[PDB]
Design a binder for this molecule. Sequence first.
Ligand code: FAD
Ligand code: CL
Length: 485
Amino acid sequence: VKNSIIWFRKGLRLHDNPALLEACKDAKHVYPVFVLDPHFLQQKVSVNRYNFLLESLEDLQRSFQARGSRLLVLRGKPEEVFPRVFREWGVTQLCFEHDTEPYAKVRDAAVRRLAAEAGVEVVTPISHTLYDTDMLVARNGGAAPLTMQSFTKLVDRVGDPPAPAPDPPAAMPPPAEDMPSAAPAATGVPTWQEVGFKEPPLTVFKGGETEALARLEAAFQDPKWVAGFQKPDTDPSAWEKPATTVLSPYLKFGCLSARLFHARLLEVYRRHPAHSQPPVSLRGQLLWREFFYTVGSTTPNFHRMAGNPVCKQIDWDDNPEFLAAWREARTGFPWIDAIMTQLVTWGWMHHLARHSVACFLTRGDLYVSWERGMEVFEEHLIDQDHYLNAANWMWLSASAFFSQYFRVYSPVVFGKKYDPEGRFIRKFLPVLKDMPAKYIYEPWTAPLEVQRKAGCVVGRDYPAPIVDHAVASKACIARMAAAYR
Ligand SMILES: Cc1cc2nc3c(=O)[nH]c(=O)nc-3n(C[C@H](O)[C@H](O)[C@H](O)COP(=O)(O)OP(=O)(O)OC[C@H]3O[C@@H](n4cnc5c(N)ncnc54)[C@H](O)[C@@H]3O)c2cc1C
Ligand SMILES: [Cl-]
């Protein structure tokens, strides 16, 4: 008989899951497995992202229970648990979605060896990305395209990405009963209190496949909005109704299929011939993801500056004070501190909001290394993605993909264009709520009487600016020019 394990790492969904469909074929028992390490905090992970994962696991559990099955959350490391459950469960096949991150390739190779020793067939279909990333490299002549323009050309020669896989059957082969490693008390989904977090999560975005599909349909409720979407023209100050999809946390964990997103986009584009085109279209946004996945997976030390062949080596300063002020949202620039507060409380900010705080920390004002800011984003972002995080920080720091170091965002003027009254600032910085909109982006310029009648004295209730933007930006621009020479 066939006994299979479907191993969830990413791809936390039932729809468009060719690994799950293969595991359930001609099977007498299927074991849906996630592997949880109960010491991940004894080694930089916010409760926001971790609880989002836990809610995604709880959604998978309800989905498997509705099909007569059960999600098994095994505690330990994969290389120490799988050889045991291989023999205990009489496993003949192991299925999981392919993953191209550096740690995944080391982990998965070791598990592939352990499965060969136990006589277990390993099936690893591709469904986290739109295409086989290695296939794109081979059709490009053995090299990853290094520009978005050439990447869009390659994927248009390849053609449309594969269609999403069909839905799994309404009933699934259940786990075998009375297997000691599948006992309910040891295979259940823990709470954020049980993994060790003391402070509660504060994000407003719930995890799970069910929420991801609900948010997918809400975005496609207005097909004219989807067809005319232009990413650079969207508002970074909208928080009640964000200006983009906020599907990034669901695409990172795999709660939403990228190929289903793409298939729904083409359906809209067929009936709107004046739809936006890459790179600014909504399809273009999925291609930025596909672009950074393809270059990143084929570039050594992609997440670092030293030893990275695509990243320029810049003489980044080591100022712990500036990084701490940026990290703790006490820079004195309300637009900057508001976005950094949204990072810690929501775990998500608009793309142009991330532009403002990343340029400020790096080539714009403080000249701190992009690796130090990427470490801050990696902790708090609920959509933290290894390749997308590193590639965009190199872009914003003008270390790779981007070279125009004379374009420096003003931490004062940028948000005023979208939000003159400062509604975004007042929401996340309540200390500056009664400050007149004339000084809300520059509170240090308000007369003391205004600061006192607003309950916000600079230096007492809200910090003074750590730098003068006019002085800091010119110096950073001059040092960036010497580097590019
Ligand atoms: C410094 C910095 C760090 C970033 N780190 C991350 C990260 O860790 N994880 C992450 O998902 N994105 C990251 N981004 C990219 C981008 O800002 C987010 O993908 C976007 O804000 C997500 O919002 P959305 O889902 O509403 O996007 P939409 O505009 O609705 O786009 C749809 C999807 O396309 C993809 N996408 C959109 N923009 C980009 C982009 N610039 N690069 C790559 N893929 C993109 C995402 O999967 C996104 O969900 C980063 C950008 C910057 C400037
Ligand atoms: Cl600007």
